[PDB]
Design a protein around this ligand. Structure first.
Ligand code: 8XQ
Ligand code: 8XQ
Ligand code: ZN
Ligand code: ZN
Lengths: 342, 342
């Protein structure tokens, strides 16, 4: 019906069959509806981006030259720089902010970061394959000037004309970075929101992206701002604790499967959960992050949900600073509302 | 024991008997301990005021010349100015901030203010006595320059030397006003806190003062800041709703009965409930309000409870302004803490 999820799997050209099938998606408790897949030249697509709603653009050629990328070509050409590689005991990658790690002395990491050369990432990977199992790796590394010449040529051949025009038309700030992501089949990036605009350019393999609007904050229960998992959902999507998180039962997502050549606009403050399909082999993505447009001169009501999220964050941070201890934030907030506003 | 309440009733000079007895106090659910009654010349008294804790000073002569005041002498001399007179259907006077009355269109007042000449206050009073019952009146009027000559002489003969030295030693701001209060026996001013320092100078009859420290905020459940009853306890002391207000069961007060010539220091942010004794006739009090000392240059931790109260107020006000509507404050606060900090 009007909940279709990712919709039917798309047919590859040349009668090559379905690129993926439903058996490759994980099972979750909530419904979803499709994110529209549109031509870059379609007015509707421009309309979505302007109104800060997700859209998959199928023909931008944004990273056309990178479509030839695989492990051998990258190992060959990407150079000798260090690469951040995250590892996990489970399919779920728990990212954490090392700087806030002191705020909760109690916190113990379930995801280790290791710096290593690209060829070492490739090896450890190969090792785990034949090994084999069960550790998972996810390379997540900003693209910098240490990259080899051929990678530089590829980068230069991205569709900067198109994306630069987007940046201009939306009044966004500057491109803050490109992130290279290379994951193992089954890898999951759990639901979280980012504060920057994102064009998610898919290169190799398929990723199922599940987005939730900023007005679903109440259903997704982010960690406290001072927590190392700031901006992530507390909810375990695999075993949701309806007692701690009752409104997760009301959550509705927007879902799509992106493949090579697709670009997903993930608007700032939109929650997103990203999974590399089961048994779909390695995945490669490059993200383009931009600072959002400056907040308007005179503020108009009613506020967007993302502005209320901003307010909440700011109150949290301010209490942390005023009280002199982030640990005291919750107890003051409780004192403030119990029998007064609840 | 170490909960004594007001303690034994004091013996009037000349074998005139107990000025009051326990039967004249209302019954409440919580325990109390006595506020110390000390000489103004006693170092301990200076110590309490400095550390912002209540003390009754028994010999300041602060309002010595006003000790002759009664209704006839005041009617005769206080002049022709208008006087604010509050009226109530019950013994409890519900004060409300008329300016915030728009914030809650739902709110309907249970306490009317009426302006009238002093002689009219005296008459309406007399009327109710013979009438008689059941309306209650409470005259509460700032002392201004419209007062007759004799009242001016009395005012000038207050002990300004003593109180001016207090103001100086505590580094307080300026005297912002003197309030004249004349109540009917049984009148109650319900628990609330003020943001200024207060010397409560008793003149005629007896008032039982029950104070709670600022760290009992969690037990006293003030109204939302934007509510017309801002700074008052939501709890009905006569029928406390332990379901809405469970921590009221943990509340402990400091209690005293003040009579003619006594001065009670009520420190800023300290809750206080004030009742004119049952069957003790008319009561007269003058309050002296001062702005507290400026907040210290470099803030030190740990914070005093009154500073956390200030923080909470400020967060409440800020949300009201940011959201554009005070009605939205509670729902945002709930969204902020549910499943996150509780
Ligand atoms: O792994 C991904 O596909 C991904 C996509 C979009 C994001 O905003 C991310 N943020 C942190 C880690 C991974 C991601
Ligand atoms: O009525 C009183 O005795 C009284 C004493 C101290 C206060 O701070 C008050 N504030 C508002 C109304 C009355 C009072
Ligand atoms: Zn992210
Ligand atoms: Zn008051």
């Amino acid at each position: 019906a009007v909940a279709s999820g990712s919709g039917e799997p798309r047919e590859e050209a040349g009668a090559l069959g379905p690129a993926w099938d439903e058996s490759q998606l994980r099972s979750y408790s909530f419904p979803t509806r499709p994110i529209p897949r549109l031509s870059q030249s379609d007015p509707r697509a421009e309309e979505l981006i302007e109104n800060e709603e997700p859209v998959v653009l199928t023909d931008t050629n944004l990273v056309y030259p990178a479509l030839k990328w695989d492990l051998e070509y990258l190992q060959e050409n990407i150079g000798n720089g260090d690469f951040s590689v995250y590892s996990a005991s489970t399919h779920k990658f728990l990212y954490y902010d090392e700087k806030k790690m002191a705020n909760f002395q109690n916190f113990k990491p379930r995801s280790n970061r290791e710096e290593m050369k690209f060829h070492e990432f490739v090896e450890k990977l190969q090792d785990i394959q034949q090994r084999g199992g069960e550790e998972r790796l996810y390379l997540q590394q900003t693209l910098n000037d240490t990259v080899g010449r051929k990678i530089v040529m590829d980068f230069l051949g991205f569709n900067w004309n198109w994306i630069n025009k987007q940046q201009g038309k939306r009044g966004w700030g500057q491109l803050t970075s490109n992130l290279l992501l290379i994951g193992m089949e089954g890898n999951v990036t759990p639901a979280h929101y980012d504060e920057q605009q994102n064009f998610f350019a898919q290169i190799k393999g398929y990723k199922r992206c599940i987005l939730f609007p900023p007005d679903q904050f109440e259903c997704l229960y982010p960690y406290p701002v001072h927590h190392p998992c700031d901006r992530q959902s507390q909810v375990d999507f695999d075993n949701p604790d309806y007692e701690r998180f009752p409104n997760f039962q009301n959550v509705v997502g927007y879902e799509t499967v992106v493949g090579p050549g697709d670009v997903l606009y993930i608007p700032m403050y939109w929650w997103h959960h990203i999974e590399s399909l089961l048994n779909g082999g390695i995945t490669i993505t490059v993200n383009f992050w931009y600072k959002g447009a400056p907040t308007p001169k005179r503020i108009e009501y009613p506020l967007k949900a993302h502005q209320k999220v901003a307010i909440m964050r700011n109150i949290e941070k301010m209490l942390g600073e005023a009280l002199g201890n982030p640990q005291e934030v919750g107890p003051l907030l409780n004192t403030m509302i119990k029998g007064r506003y609840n």
